[PDB]
């Protein structure tokens, strides 16, 4: 679900429409129908990922609704700032699903957020991890999600759009502020709910080598990336300031 | 662009095994590459106690 | 390289620019391109001296095979069956060349594409120009023969088209 | 001394044996590695010729 | 009902866009009329665009 | 935005359609009209190869921007005044379209005005 | 071409004359080497044909069928061996005395330069199918089978024998050479038309079309193995090689007649692959498969477009190589369970692990996966009937949809779950069915890597 | 799971059943311990005011409406214990579970590993050989006339006696076989 | 999993723990036989209860049909250990 | 009150819902009592033919044989024509054929036109 | 290597509703008249060091204290060597 | 790979210093790397340059004539 599901083999369909953008740009129609079909979709899945209870199903449906956010940025005619974003996904989307699955298995395979309780103190790894990751999904300024998800919106905002798909894209995003503090909150917040033998254990280098390594990624890659690559689109260098 | 090996030949249509390296190839392969590295890292102690590991690996790959 | 000649697939003089380091920072570029060169070009390149050498110890030739001109289909007789095969090998053999004829413009084309980057649009006008030229042509010879294609259903719709060609002369002219 | 075996039975050998079939078999045929023909630029020069792009046409600068 | 309160008002939206209050973007030579389909044995008409 | 509640819910007529802008023309305001100025020529621009859409009257600072791109590679950051500069360049492109859009909205309301003074003179 | 019809005939004083226990290591291994030797009809010519003699002729349609017969017989022979153990040696020895008379008519139909010829041929590869399936088979239907198998094809050939002798009083000669250089076309007349439907329907009763595809599950089922092998790989390809060769004379009649065959394929694609979806038997979903890409192939040559053919021919080979290993992994399933019944037996993975691999890449094989020929032949087809009419593509994707579908049914109702408790007689795979479906699986990847060798005449 | 099936279930089953469930799915709304705690014991306060009720007809009238309350506010997302039939593992280790009688086709080579094994179950396999006459019988001479009315099974009435149609309730191959 | 291998004394324990928190019975007065509907005075209800204090600690749910014939809490511990595979 | 659940076709009534089951009976007691001195008949002779050691084999499930039986051969015996089989029978068989016909027939015939009259702009159309 | 260390389970009179919210549950629960029977068994949730616990914007800033302390040693750093 | 933990049976499990110190130095990192960049970049969140207001233009620059020359 890390590898496949989340982050790699998912994003293959929009990574096709981006390949044959310049075909992409010459018709108006099917830009429409993408940018609608993704309005659409990231407004369901962040809405049905709202009030789920399997953490599992919450990143899927997390994952599905930035699938969405890629695909109105190919309706809107910047296929390169969707790369970038698959780019960033990537690296947050697998670390959180990493998190995820550790958590899992620290709580004897208990994927239900009601038996989790507790775990700001219990575990502490997993626990900055998951807030570094769920801040850059969300969009924190000069994190990786940053890089992406913040011209995504500008973009969306200052160019010839739908209004009705621009507001649900608005409403997407609230949307998934709302179940990244939903998953905190009930999974690391409250009093232990786990069963009372407790087996929660984090000491093993492999776990942990693998997470920092994203975590150094989800931190500054970003800002490497966007820093590296030459420009490939004309900025909205003037904006209003709300 | 890489086009290395000629597959079929069918009358105008020539189909060859042809790699392209702009830059999304150049970027996205790095990226998907470090997240795996991750991901069977993490999957060395989550498949710990899974008989056929080794296989999970070979799917993976 | 010799191998391939440069006329039939033309090359713009590949001009490059020349490094202009505005800086005192090492670029790892060059040096990793010099070990790569080190550890690799070296030993690849000796390997193929020694297999060049060997092969230089015994050389040998082959020919490519000249075909005589033989009377088409037209010349030849209502139930005359031999020249009528004559025809339809030459007839074949000249629609493989016309196919290799097609795919060396289709490559053309390709390789400017790609080569041009950016301004394919601008820059490979005549090529693409060339195709629609070659590619027009190969269609009113061979577009709608269909399975079971032979020289005389070919020659069959080159004689409508050009009964129909001069039809419509005809109508210009006394119009 | 693992990681040196390794990275020769299964790094070196295969970059030889890519490099030897792309430097001496596939660019043999025309057009199937083709570049991008990289960008040029005023006040480059090309190694090729020698000779300079003219600069441009010194617009004001002012901020 | 979700489905069709859906397409409606993708509808409307498709009815009644959003953009900015600017013109249309200017483009140098021709509104780039020899780097786009090009065919430069045609001199289209000149095309020119305001300082303001 | 004001201008899309301005346009959808009053009249039509009193605010331009961003399609069809420019509808008058343009030495309209006054005589003088001085054109636009380019830097970037046809060869070092095709050169170049930035993209279509980057084509535009803000090319020279993009064509430094590479410049230093390029030349200044293991140093990310060594030119950030270039950036700098296409950016305020592209600041200058953006607010002359204001401009010419805020141009052509007066210029209808006051055509609108004219049009109903004759009108109310040709009634009384 | 003699090279390859005496050793075959030789098959058979061999095998009477060999012992009482080494008839099927004989029959195996010289049966091997004739494929060995079959083998160098593939180096064919971009010009007319590879004429050997006034009788037989070869060609890049007819070398690619030749080599698939001589080396079907192999795996038929070590398909039978195991059921045939307490048999008496006579039996055997007729056994494979109508595996070997098969092979050599098939051989000798896919040649022949004349049309008599290759009719007479044609029927007589009835007669050992026939007493295979209705000597060798175990239910009591299979005599209703055979019935069945034969006067279907009996009345769809014999008029087709009436029209040929009708041409060869018109035309004056049946060589396939002279018919193919003095085509003339056909007047659209009643006459003609059912000249036509003569000519059409004796090779579209064999595919077998949609309508007439009854006999098909009857015959496969209640066929031995090897009968289901040899039905399902070649004998079937024979009416689409009979089309091939004979739609040269029925054009341009051939425009306004496809169009009811043409939408009786179309619709019985559709309608077989969802029969498969719904089935309590193995055999008979394979034989609703065999039919689904059959009528894919008639439309294919209905098209009478070069990719059309180079499709259609492509999809023959594949097909039959992949409903071979099909029908030996439903027969080594039966010889242990003795039901025939997909939900009866299930979980055999967790028993049998390299079987369950081996069924994973027939199944995947059969889905049409890229770069495998199924694939390249699909979609030589797909693009053929799209350039001939662009609504064709939403028959087609709904057929690969629900072949992909009933291809994960079959595969995972058998292997995947649970294991019957009360089945306790599953032994070991033996070496013999593993290196059965190894010699399979192997000539397929081999082809896709060298496609030109199966795409036809007209590559 | 084990204990055999009753021809019917009784009024008590059933609210005990209503019970059962109507405090799990109040757990699962009640994510907190407090909250469920609170809750519970105000829902067996409710549940407790009509326990000494008489009249059957009002009985049934009974625990229905609360059948229909509870459908009303099922929580359509209760929580499952993960290998309950509902739960995210309830047959993941299914696919591990071998026969026992796969041993017996073992090769030589490999029975000789593990040899210790192979003879005690040599042993079993004559335990259950000479048994299993005993138990058909004790089966046969047990069993009403007309046929069993419950399936359940009686257990070994003398010494050397041993359940009836016991093999594959001792051999089951394990909760997680790897 | 790195579960560590419980044994009967283990889940005995637990039980007995799970048992004695139980402010219904007094700790002094329980027995591993001891009954629940005789020997401690308690309801159906409370039976039940205890069923699913058993399944919040334990882990895993038992079914409604083997749950309600669970009279003592050796039965419980040996309902278990079977559930579990428990060797010593 | 609350809301009534409305049973469908693909949603079926809970079997806490029903209302027959709250109507007992003497009769329905005896219904149950003997359906399920059947099962445990039935379960019964099955752990005998299982538990055997002696069996070496599969236990043929006459239930099994004759679901197969019923859903392949016994179709065509216990056929009637009847007004319902023959309209469907034709419909199903016919209606289909007939309409791709159709659709596939004015394409063909719209594509044949704008060829004849040339505006079809088949340029680099050269596979076919 | 396993955990085979004999874990012994603590005592069970250790667990006292007091100092949790389960005594608000209680005293809300007697002004009807009922009181908990599952009480106790649940103290230990609150009882450790599950005692404790942080809101989501102090989640946010797990390490703000340590982070700001190098930022303004760093700024502090730059401003006196660019100062030069 | 990692050292011997043993189970807790109802109280906070057993927590080594390790993985505490290098939670809050990755915490303290990224919360660094965020004030660093505002303080160095600030202008990529509020913004460089002043967004203009129509309606202050003056109507000499936009070349209005008064409502009777033209
Ligand atoms: C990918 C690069 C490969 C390079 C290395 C070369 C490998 C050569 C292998 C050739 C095929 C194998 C022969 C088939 C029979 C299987 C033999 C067997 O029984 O296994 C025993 C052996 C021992 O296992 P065991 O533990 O003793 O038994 C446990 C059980 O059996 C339990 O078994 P299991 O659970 O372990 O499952 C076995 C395993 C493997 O078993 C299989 O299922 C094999 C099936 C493979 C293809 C399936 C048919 C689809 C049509 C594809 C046709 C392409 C062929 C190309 C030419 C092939 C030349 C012969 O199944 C899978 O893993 C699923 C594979 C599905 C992959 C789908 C992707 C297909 C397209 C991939 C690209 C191909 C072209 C690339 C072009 C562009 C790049 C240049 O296992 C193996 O050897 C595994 C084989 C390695 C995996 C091969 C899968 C990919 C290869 C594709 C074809 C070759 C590509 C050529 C260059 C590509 C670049
Ligand atoms: C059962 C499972 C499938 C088995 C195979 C089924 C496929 C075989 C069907 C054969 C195709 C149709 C046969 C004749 C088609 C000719 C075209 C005709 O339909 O169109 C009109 C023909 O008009 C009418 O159709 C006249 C014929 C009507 C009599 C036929 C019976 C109709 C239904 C019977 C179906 C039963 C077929 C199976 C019998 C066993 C055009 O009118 P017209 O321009 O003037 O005639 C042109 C032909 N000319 C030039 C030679 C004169
Ligand atoms: C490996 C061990 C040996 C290592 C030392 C040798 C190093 C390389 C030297 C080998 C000489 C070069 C060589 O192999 O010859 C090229 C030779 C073909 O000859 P050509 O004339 O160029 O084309 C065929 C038409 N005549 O190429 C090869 O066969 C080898 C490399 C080909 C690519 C590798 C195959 C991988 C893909 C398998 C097929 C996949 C399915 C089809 C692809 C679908 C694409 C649309
Ligand atoms: C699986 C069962 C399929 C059965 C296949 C049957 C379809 C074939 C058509 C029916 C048989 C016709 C055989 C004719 C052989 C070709 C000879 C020929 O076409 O010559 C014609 C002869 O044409 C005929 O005579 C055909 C008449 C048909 C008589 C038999 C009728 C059989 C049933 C017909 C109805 C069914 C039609 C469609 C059947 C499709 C199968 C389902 C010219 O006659 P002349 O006198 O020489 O002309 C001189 C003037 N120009
Ligand atoms: C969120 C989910 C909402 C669910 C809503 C559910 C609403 C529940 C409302 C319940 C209403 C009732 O009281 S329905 C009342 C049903 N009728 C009776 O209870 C009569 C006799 N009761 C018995 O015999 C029992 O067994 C008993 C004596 C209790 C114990 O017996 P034990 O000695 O064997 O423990």
């Known amino acids: 679900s890390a590898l496949l599901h989340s982050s790699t083999m998912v994003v293959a369909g929009v990574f096709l429409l981006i390949r044959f953008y310049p075909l992409m740009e010459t018709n108006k129609l099917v830009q429409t129908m993408t940018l609608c079909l993704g309005a659409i979709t990231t407004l369901f899945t962040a809405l049905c990922a709202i009030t789920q209870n399997d953490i599992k199903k919450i990143v899927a449906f997390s994952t599905s609704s930035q699938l969405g956010l890629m695909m109105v940025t190919i309706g809107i005619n910047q296929p390169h700032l969707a790369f970038l974003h698959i780019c960033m996904h990537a690296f947050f989307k697998a670390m959180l699903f990493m998190c995820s699955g550790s958590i899992i298995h620290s709580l004897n395979d208990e994927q239900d957020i009601r038996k989790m309780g507790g775990l700001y103190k219990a575990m502490p790894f997993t626990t900055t991890a998951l807030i570094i990751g769920s801040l850059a999904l969300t969009g924190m300024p000069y994190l990786t999600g940053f890089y992406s998800k913040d011209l995504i919106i500008e973009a969306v905002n200052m160019s010839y759009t739908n209004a009705w798909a621009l507001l649900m894209t608005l409403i997407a995003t609230s949307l998934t502020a709302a179940y990244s503090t939903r998953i905190i909150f009930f999974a690391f917040l409250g009093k232990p709910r786990f069963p009372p033998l407790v087996l929660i254990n984090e000491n093993n280098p492999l776990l942990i080598n693998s997470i920092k390594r994203l975590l150094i990624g989800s931190i500054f890659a970003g800002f490497i990336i966007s820093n590296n690559i030459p420009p490939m689109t004309v900025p909205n260098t003037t904006m209003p300031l709300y | 662009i890489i086009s290395n090996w000629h597959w079929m030949t069918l009358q105008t249509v020539e189909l060859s095994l042809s790699f392209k390296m702009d830059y999304f190839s150049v970027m996205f392969i790095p990226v998907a590459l470090f997240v795996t590295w991750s991901i069977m890292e993490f999957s060395m102690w989550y498949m710990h106690s899974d008989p056929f590991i080794n296989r999970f690996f070979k799917y993976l790959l | 390289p010799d191998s391939w000649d440069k006329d039939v697939y033309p090359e713009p003089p590949r001009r490059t620019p020349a490094p202009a380091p505005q800086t005192s920072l090492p670029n790892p570029v060059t040096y990793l391109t010099k070990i790569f060169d080190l550890l690799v070009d070296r030993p690849v390149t000796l390997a193929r001296e020694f297999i060049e050498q060997q092969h230089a110890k015994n050389r040998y030739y082959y020919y490519h095979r000249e075909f005589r001109r033989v009377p088409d289909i037209t010349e030849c007789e209502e139930k005359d069956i031999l020249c009528m095969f004559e025809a339809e090998m030459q007839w074949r053999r000249d629609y493989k060349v016309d196919q290799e004829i097609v795919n060396i413009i289709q490559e053309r084309l390709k390789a400017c594409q790609q080569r041009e980057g950016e301004s394919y649009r601008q820059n490979c006008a005549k090529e693409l120009e060339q195709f629609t030229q070659v590619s027009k042509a190969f269609q009113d010879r061979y577009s709608d023969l269909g399975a079971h294609y032979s020289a005389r259903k070919c020659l069959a719709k080159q004689k409508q088209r050009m009964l129909a060609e001069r039809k419509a002369a005809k109508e210009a002219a006394a119009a | 001394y693992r990681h040196s075996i390794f990275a020769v039975t299964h790094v070196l050998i295969p970059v030889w044996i890519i490099h030897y079939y792309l430097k001496y078999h596939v660019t043999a045929k025309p057009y199937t590695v083709v570049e991008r023909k990289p960008r040029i630029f005023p006040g480059d020069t090309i190694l090729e010729t020698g000779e300079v792009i003219p600069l441009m046409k010194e617009f004001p600068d002012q901020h | 009902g979700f489905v069709a309160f859906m397409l409606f008002m993708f509808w409307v939206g498709e009815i009644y866009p959003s953009y900015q209050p600017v013109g249309p973007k200017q483009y140098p030579y021709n509104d780039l009329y020899l780097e786009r389909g090009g065919d430069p044995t045609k001199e289209p008409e000149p095309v020119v665009h305001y300082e303001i | 935005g004001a201008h899309l509640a301005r346009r959808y819910l009053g009249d039509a007529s009193k605010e331009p359609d961003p399609l069809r802008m420019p509808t008058f023309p343009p030495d309209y305001g006054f005589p003088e009209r001085k054109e636009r100025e380019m830097v970037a020529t046809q060869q070092e621009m095709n050169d170049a190869q930035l993209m279509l859409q980057q084509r535009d009257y803000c090319a020279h600072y993009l064509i430094q921007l590479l410049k230093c791109k390029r030349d200044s590679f293991p140093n990310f950051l060594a030119c950030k005044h270039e950036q700098h500069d296409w950016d305020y360049c592209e600041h200058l492109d953006y607010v002359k379209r204001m401009k010419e859009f805020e141009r052509e909205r007066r210029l209808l309301q006051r055509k609108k005005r004219r049009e109903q003074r004759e009108a109310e003179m040709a009634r009384g | 071409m003699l090279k390859i019809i005496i050793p075959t005939t030789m098959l058979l004083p061999m095998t009477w004359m060999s012992k009482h226990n080494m008839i099927w290591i004989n029959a195996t291994v010289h049966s091997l080497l004739i494929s060995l030797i079959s083998l160098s009809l593939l180096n064919q010519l971009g010009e007319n044909s590879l004429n050997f003699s006034l009788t037989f002729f070869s060609d890049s349609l007819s070398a690619p069928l030749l080599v698939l017969t001589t080396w079907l017989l192999p795996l038929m022979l070590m398909a039978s061996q195991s059921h045939l153990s307490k048999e008496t040696t006579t039996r055997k020895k007729l056994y494979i005395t109508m595996l070997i008379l098969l092979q050599l008519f098939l051989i000798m139909t896919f040649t022949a330069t004349e049309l008599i010829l290759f009719y007479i041929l044609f029927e007589a590869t009835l007669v050992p199918t026939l007493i295979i399936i209705t000597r060798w088979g175990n239910q009591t239907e299979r005599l209703n089978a055979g019935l069945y198998f034969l006067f279907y094809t009996l009345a769809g050939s014999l008029p087709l024998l009436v029209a040929l002798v009708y041409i060869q009083n018109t035309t004056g000669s049946l060589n396939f050479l002279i018919i193919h250089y003095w085509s003339h076309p056909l007047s659209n007349s009643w006459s003609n038309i059912f000249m036509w439907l003569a000519c059409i329907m004796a090779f579209m009763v064999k595919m077998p079309l949609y309508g007439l595809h009854l006999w098909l599950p009857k015959a496969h089922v209640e066929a031995p193995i090897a009968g289901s092998m040899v039905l399902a790989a070649v004998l079937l390809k024979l009416g689409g090689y009979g089309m091939m060769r004979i739609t040269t004379i029925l054009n341009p009649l051939t425009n306004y007649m496809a169009y009811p065959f043409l939408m009786l394929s179309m619709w019985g694609m559709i309608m077989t692959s969802s029969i498969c979806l719904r089935q309590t038997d193995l055999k008979s979903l394979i034989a609703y498969s065999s039919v689904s890409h059959m009528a894919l192939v008639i439309v294919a040559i209905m098209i009478q477009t070069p990719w059309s053919f180079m499709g259609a021919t492509a999809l023959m080979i594949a097909h039959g190589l992949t409903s071979s290993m099909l029908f030996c992994l439903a027969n080594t399933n039966y010889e242990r369970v003795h039901s025939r019944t997909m939900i009866l037996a299930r979980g055999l993975q967790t028993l049998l692990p390299l079987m369950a691999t081996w069924w994973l890449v027939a199944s995947l094989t059969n889905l049409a996966l890229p770069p495998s020929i199924n694939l390249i032949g699909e979609l030589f087809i797909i693009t053929a009937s799209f350039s001939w009419s662009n609504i064709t593509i939403i028959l087609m994707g709904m057929n690969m949809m629900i072949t992909a579908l009933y291809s994960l049914y079959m595969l995972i109702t058998t292997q995947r779950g649970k294991y019957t408790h009360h089945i306790n007689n599953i032994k070991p795979s033996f070496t013999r069915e593993n290196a059965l479906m190894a010699l399979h699986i192997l000539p397929l990847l081999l082809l896709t890597l060298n496609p030109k060798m199966i795409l036809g005449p007209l590559y | 799971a084990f204990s055999a099936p009753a021809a019917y279930l009784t009024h008590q089953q059933k609210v005990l059943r209503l019970y059962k469930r109507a405090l799990r799915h109040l757990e699962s709304w009640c994510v907190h311990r407090d909250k469920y705690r609170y809750f519970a014991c105000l829902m067996r306060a409710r549940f407790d005011e009509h326990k000494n009720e008489k009249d059957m007809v009002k009985a049934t009238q009974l625990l229905r409406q609360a059948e229909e309350e509870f459908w009303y506010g099922q929580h359509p997302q209760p929580y499952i214990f993960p290998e309950s039939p509902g739960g995210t593992s309830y047959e993941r280790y299914e696919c591990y579970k071998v026969p026992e009688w796969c041993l017996d086709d073992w090769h030589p080579s490999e029975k000789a590993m593990y040899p210790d094994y192979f003879a005690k179950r040599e042993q079993w396999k004559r335990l259950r050989r000479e048994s299993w006459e005993r138990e058909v019988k004790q089966l046969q001479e047990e069993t009403p006339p007309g046929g069993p009315r419950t399936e359940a099974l009686p257990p070994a009435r003398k010494e050397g006696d041993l359940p009836p149609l016991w093999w594959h309730i001792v051999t089951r191959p394990r909760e997680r076989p790897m | 999993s790195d579960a560590p291998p419980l044994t009967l004394e283990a889940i005995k324990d637990r039980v007995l723990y799970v048992l004695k928190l139980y402010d219904k019975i007094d700790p002094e007065k329980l027995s591993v036989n001891s009954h629940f509907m005789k020997d401690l005075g308690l309801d159906s209800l409370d039976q039940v209860e205890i069923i699913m204090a058993m399944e919040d600690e334990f882990g895993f749910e038992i079914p409604d049909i083997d749950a309600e014939k669970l009279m003592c809490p050796q039965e419980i511990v040996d309902y278990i250990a079977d559930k579990k595979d428990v060797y010593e | 009150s609350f809301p009534k659940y409305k049973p469908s076709r693909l949603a079926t009534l809970p079997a806490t819902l029903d209302p027959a089951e709250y109507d007992i009976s003497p009769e329905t007691r005896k219904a149950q009592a003997e359906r399920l001195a059947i099962r445990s008949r039935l379960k019964r002779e099955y752990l005998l033919q299982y538990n055997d050691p002696n069996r070496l084999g599969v236990i043929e499930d006459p239930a099994l044989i004759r679901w197969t039986y019923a859903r392949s051969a016994n179709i065509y015996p216990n056929f009637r024509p009847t007004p319902k089989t023959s309209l469907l029978g034709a419909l199903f068989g016919i209606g289909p054929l007939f309409f791709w016909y159709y659709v596939f027939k004015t394409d063909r015939d719209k594509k044949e036109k704008l060829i004849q009259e040339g505006k079809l702009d088949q340029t680099f159309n050269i596979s076919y | 290597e396993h955990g085979h260390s004999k874990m012994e389970l603590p005592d069970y009179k250790q667990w006292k509703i007091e100092g949790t919210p389960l005594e608000t549950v209680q005293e809300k629960l007697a002004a009807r008249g009922l009181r908990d029977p599952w009480g106790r068994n649940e103290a230990w949730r609150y009882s450790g060091g599950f005692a404790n616990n942080v809101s989501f914007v102090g989640a946010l800033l797990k390490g703000f204290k340590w982070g700001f302390a190098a930022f303004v040693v760093a700024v502090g750093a730059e401003y006196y060597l660019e100062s030069q | ?70």
């Open chain 12, 1 to 70: 790979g990692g050292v011997h933990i043993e189970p807790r049976y109802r109280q906070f499990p057993q927590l080594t210093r390790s993985q505490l110190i290098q939670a809050e130095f990755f915490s303290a990192t990224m919360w660094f790397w965020i004030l660093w960049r505002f303080w160095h970049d600030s202008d990529a969140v509020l913004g460089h340059f002043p967004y203009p207001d129509p309606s202050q233009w003056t109507d000499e620059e936009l070349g209005i004539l008064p409502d009777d020359e033209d």
